[PDB]
Design a protein around this ligand. Structure first.
Ligand SMILES: CC(C)[C@@H](Nc1ccc(CNC(=O)[C@H]2SCCN2C(=O)C[C@H](N)Cc2cc(F)c(F)cc2F)cc1)C(=O)O
Ligand SMILES: CC(C)[C@@H](Nc1ccc(CNC(=O)[C@H]2SCCN2C(=O)C[C@H](N)Cc2cc(F)c(F)cc2F)cc1)C(=O)O
Lengths: 726, 726
């Protein structure tokens, strides 16, 4: 009777998880693919018309993957030649197709090898970066206009984020920001002139005779940072002036004093724009609100309009200060910030009234400000049931702060405790995402009544297919320590016997403001081991975890590589004295930050573990970029915290590895955690004379994405864990 | 009773092998260290005086490792700051000490960071290369003279060999050649301008933040070769002319036609110099003999003086055409060359009489022309007992070629069958090196009587220390195949039972003109496994082995990666049907070329093996340098043998790896077999979905020399073999 979730049922991915990714084109209309054609749904009654045919693109000669329709619904952009670079950066070519005249444009097209292109919020104005310069077309068929000329590769990035501004701050490539009615366009430029490079080898296919040395700007902690500058241009007169005039916003003076960054820039009104500027020591940021001048033509920022935002126990925000959310008029806004008790709640500011008013309280951080009508503010947070990995949607009335209504609570909390959401334009309709504990369920809701229309995807298909197979189970809970409760979880095998000795495996990522303890239902490697192998996977959230207040998340400021690693072991301890946790067989594995921790853990004399696996792990903080590292360690100099970068290195513990069975794995083309860190980890043990299992993956970046490598790694880990155990 | 040669007794090296490395300063005097001081021995009676004190160098402030005394015995050069680069290249600083006035020189010293320095054969003239230029000092304290100014790093090498000219042709760095009476000096220059580079990462100690990208000129097979040029200068008038005039020798025309090299240049007389020039297709070389002109001042080469030397079945020579050996006058010489039957015997040439006369015959190649008095010619060869790995010294009389006397035959062939030798100047005394089968024995002999004076080192110390431990044993022999006998050998365990099933391990290097079957007595990793683990190590010489005629060595010309790999397995077969060779447990491991073979072997469908280990193995010949590769494969183009580079790639066999248990190991800073080859080997299996054991060694060059890495690797191999077996 029945089999289990094997490696193959995993790797080859037999059990599919149907989504329903849609994009609203208005306030009551969105677009949803259907494999062949692309239907256009009507938010309300759902009278699904067919927007664009599928066969209308066979004879294209190219392999097309993405599309982008302007507001006008008059042009579809076609993406192909996708060449991943970093996390979100990609270089490809695009073709514009005129929807109305049912014909494909031909002359004055977007250059091949572009870097980013986009529609403006309204109107089909196309802005784009190519060869590191910003060109803009008012009309598709018409020529174009170069807003910059200074653009010099791997030096001056116009309209696009360099390496570090991508991964750590914006988590995107798009360094341009269109204005509400497509009248203004604001970009961000970076002089990487003195920014240091990190070279390495790429080997391509067996045919390449001489390897290629990839050099890319990358400020490893304490090094030089690419100086930034912000501008704005009038996309209207640029067509009839010759050289489009590009006015620059500078300051804040509180930022000019030294090394600065650029947190999150967002418009408020057609002539009002708010820019958040962070300091290198990320405890002090300042938000600026500048408007447009009809006389002077310059963007002025009346000093009595800024909102200084500081932190006495660390950095500012979760991974950057959250984006403001202005009201319609544009003189009032809402930004999720750290409060007194250290919980992140929607403070309501005024463009001149310095202070604010938190329109929420308690011991439950708020996740994000989704929608904002001059009636309700639909946000997400971990309040219901009290748990941190519990995502829900609440709609607080802007007039009375007692009027706070949950919407995703009782939809079926027997199957849902984790959400996120997609709204229409005027937010007259929203699409909820139930991603756990049970199977994901996407559903539609009308806003004026907050009533549930219908079910867009119930996964009943996948579901019936899991009754034929003995799946595991997820016990998510908390343990008490130092008077505070910390959250962990266990992917328990089927037919769980709490009286027999089992082998444990700690799956730890646990990096600052993370969360390894949530109701999220995933069918990953954890799911295989738990079922087929009978190895209990477990993740613990300790003294650094986010979404649980600042007292928990900030307790690692500057002490990175101490508590979040101790707590892990202290956790491993708490499990030992639980019965089924067969002391003589406990494991710990981690990827990325997870590998780093899993590295400090092994070299602790803990002896709690028999073996361990670290994938692309950090091992000395000078080896990672500053915008992330400096935020949790200050500067690597004796005047700051250099003493600790040196204490928290996987290398100094190399000696205590003699007991364990370490297994290092690393992409030899990792843009993120440079192979370097792992090149020193090995050489560490080689010098201390300690055998260990090495395994490199050629050309593989930080995620060891490639189909083959992916299937490969998780295989080599299965052979390992099911050795060190069964 | 007794233990065995464990890993530790190996790695930590407990059992030492006393040598007796000496250097003759004349015809009856040499220098031999004594740890503290440095004694000077008298070749004859042996009345050992003490040359230089040890304490005379305490207060040196530096760490000194080497010394070099001029002929004059008037100056000692002191080496320190040794920075290994490649195989023989090294960069360090040197201090000259005046022996007579017992004082150290101070001003006008050798610049720090020099690249090579040397005494002339007579007189204390110092020639040296620094920053890629050739300077020469007549006197130590006096200034110096720059013979070149074109010297530009990683482009123009004056007085020093680039990467490829070091490893494959000269096996040295010294690209200058002093003339007999220090009157002339001849250098070799290299325009590496178009020579391609091979970059890679070096990571240094944990402190380096940004890795360093090592770029070095290196012509991988079929690429561009660094064009060479040869000169000569008058070290006498250079002191009194200003710019020392540097006359160039060009041609041969047979060489100007296309891509050429420079085999081996050697003087004959104060005004006679012979230069050997090879073609890119290494089957055709030409030796030139040019003299000095008193009128014209130019070095002329009367065409009727050259000695064309071609090969119809391969390249010319063993790894380069052997060096000529002229007679005193300088009009007659001896060069070991391939003869009719294809055996390398001392042909005797005349500077004008085109042909020659072989003063030796038979089925035993000659190793080398050691000494040459106008009486006898003391060479080495594998004639005695008929075996190939049998080295001995013979002294054939120049007047009668029947007068051929062995000297190292009966000294105790119960303990000796392998030699090599060090002669005095006028060869009035020679020091023999018995390196196998039993313990090494160094001894002295007088030449005028060829009588054995005394024993310089008998190893009786080490010896007595091997009676307390059960050492293995070495059965060296041959097997018959295709009517020809091929040589193999077995490092058999103690108390060998030829009736019980044992596990075998093929230790194969077997590359062109190599020898894995010889009477050499070594205490390496093989010795550990054989004893303690009871795994029978074995090496086989097949269809490519040298020292056994051309019919055996040349049978792989252009077919590299076919017979020498087949024969290996065919050999593995011959062992299987021998009893103790437990079929269900046979291994094969190889380093460098050895790993390559051991790679082709695994992917053969042979099924003969259960597992295998390859260290820094070649895996596609485009990945190695041309001067070595082109010699055994011609050029990688369809007009030559490109078709076969592609057949002989470890990658195409990636599929047949599913059965075996491959284990790849490779230095990540290998100047020789670039990590590249192994980066493709892995990616090969990753794509065919085949689990394998990877293990890289950071910064380690081709030999994984470093104490720690060395101990490490051989450990990781012991865990493996003693798993795949015991
Ligand atoms: C291991 C795998 C499953 C997957 N893990 C992973 C874990 C968490 C997240 C969520 N990201 C965020 O919330 C935001 S906000 C600013 C950018 N955020 C980031 O996390 C950027 C960091 N550079 C991520 C990172 C940190 C390290 F310390 C490190 F050594 C390597 C790294 F890649 C994404 C990925 C992965 O790493 O690709
Ligand atoms: C494996 C270890 C013990 C040891 N093996 C090794 C084997 C043989 C020799 C002796 N060399 C000679 O007689 C002459 S003459 C012209 C230069 N000769 C050479 O052999 C030059 C070749 N380039 C050597 C070589 C290197 C490689 F990396 C490779 F894959 C293949 C190769 F052939 C030295 C070392 C080692 O290579 O480090």
């Amino acid at each position: 009777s029945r089999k289990t979730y094997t490696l193959t049922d995993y790797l080859k991915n037999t059990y599919r998880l149907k989504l329903y990714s849609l994009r609203w084109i208005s306030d009551h209309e969105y677009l949803y693919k259907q494999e062949n054609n692309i239907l256009v749904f009507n938010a309300e009654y759902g009278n699904s018309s067919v927007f664009l045919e599928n066969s209308t693109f066979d004879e294209f000669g190219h392999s097309i993957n993405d599309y982008s329709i302007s507001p006008d619904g008059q042009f579809i952009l076609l993406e192909y030649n996708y060449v991943k670079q970093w996390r979100h950066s990609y270089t490809a070519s695009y073709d514009i197709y005129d929807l109305n005249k049912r014909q494909l444009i031909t002359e004055e097209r977007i250059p091949n090898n572009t870097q980013w292109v986009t529609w403006s919020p309204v109107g089909h104005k196309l802005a784009y970066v190519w060869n590191n310069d910003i060109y803009v077309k008012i009309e598709p068929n018409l020529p174009s206009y170069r807003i910059t000329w200074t653009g010099k590769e791997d030096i001056i990035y116009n309209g696009i984020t360099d390496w570090v501004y991508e991964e750590e701050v914006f988590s995107a490539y798009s360094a341009l920001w269109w204005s509400p009615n497509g009248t203004f366009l604001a970009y961000a430029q970076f002089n990487d002139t003195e920014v240091p490079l990190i070279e390495y080898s790429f080997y391509s296919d067996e045919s390449l005779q001489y390897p290629k040395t990839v050099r890319v700007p990358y400020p490893k902690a304490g090094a030089v940072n690419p100086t930034v500058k912000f501008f704005v241009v009038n996309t209207d007169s640029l067509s009839s002036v010759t050289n489009a005039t590009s006015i620059q916003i500078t300051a804040p003076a509180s930022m000019l004093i030294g090394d600065h960054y650029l947190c999150d820039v967002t418009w408020a009104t057609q002539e009002r724009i708010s820019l958040q500027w962070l300091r290198r020591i990320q405890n002090y940021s300042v938000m600026d609100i500048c408007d447009y001048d009809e006389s002077s033509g310059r963007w002025n920022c009346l000093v009595a309009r800024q909102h200084i935002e500081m932190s006495t126990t660390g950095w500012v925000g979760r991974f950057r200060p959250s984006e403001p959310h202005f009201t319609l008029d544009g003189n009032s806004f809402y930004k999720i910030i750290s409060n007194e008790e250290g919980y992140r709640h929607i403070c309501y500011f005024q463009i001149d009234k310095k202070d604010c008013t938190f329109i929420t309280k308690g011991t439950w951080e708020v996740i994000g400000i989704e929608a904002l009508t001059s009636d309700y503010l639909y946000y997400i947070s971990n309040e219901y049931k009290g748990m941190p990995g519990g995502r829900n949607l609440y709609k607080i009335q802007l007039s009375d702060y007692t009027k706070v209504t949950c919407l995703s609570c009782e939809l079926n909390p027997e199957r849902c405790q984790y959400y996120s959401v997609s709204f229409s334009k005027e937010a007259k309709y929203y699409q909820l995402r139930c991603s756990g504990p049970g199977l994901p369920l996407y559903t539609l809701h009308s806003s004026v009544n907050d009533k549930g229309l219908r079910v867009l995807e119930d996964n009943s298909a996948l579901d019936k297919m899991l009754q034929n197979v003995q799946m595991p189970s997820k016990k998510l809970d908390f343990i008490i320590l130092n008077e505070t409760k910390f959250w962990y979880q266990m992917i328990l095998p089927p037919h769980f016997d709490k009286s027999k000795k089992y082998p444990l495996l700690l799956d730890v990522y646990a990096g600052p403001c993370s969360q390894k303890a949530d109701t999220v239902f995933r069918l990953n490697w954890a799911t295989y081991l738990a079922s087929t192998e009978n190895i209990i996977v477990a993740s613990f959230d300790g003294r650094g975890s986010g979404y649980q207040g600042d007292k928990i998340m900030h307790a690692i400021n500057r002490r990175l590589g101490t508590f979040e690693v101790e707590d892990q072991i202290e956790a491993a301890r708490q499990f030992s004295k639980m019965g089924f946790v067969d002391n003589k067989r406990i494991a710990i594995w981690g990827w990325s930050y997870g590998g780093y921790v899993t590295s400090m853990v092994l070299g602790s004399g803990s002896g709690v573990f028999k073996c361990g696996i670290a994938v692309a792990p950090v091992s000395r903080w000078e080896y990672y970029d500053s915008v992330y590292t400096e935020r949790y360690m200050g500067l690597p100099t004796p005047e700051d915290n250099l003493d600790h970068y040196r204490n928290s290195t996987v290398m100094s513990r190399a000696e205590n590895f003699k007991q364990v069975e370490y297994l290092l794995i690393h992409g030899t083309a990792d843009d993120n955690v440079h192979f370097q860190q792992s090149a020193q980890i090995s050489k560490a043990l080689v010098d201390v004379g300690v055998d260990f299992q090495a395994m490199w993956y050629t050309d593989e970046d930080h995620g060891i994405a490639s189909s083959t490598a992916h299937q490969h790694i998780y295989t080599h880990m299965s052979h390992f864990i099911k050795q060190c155990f069964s």
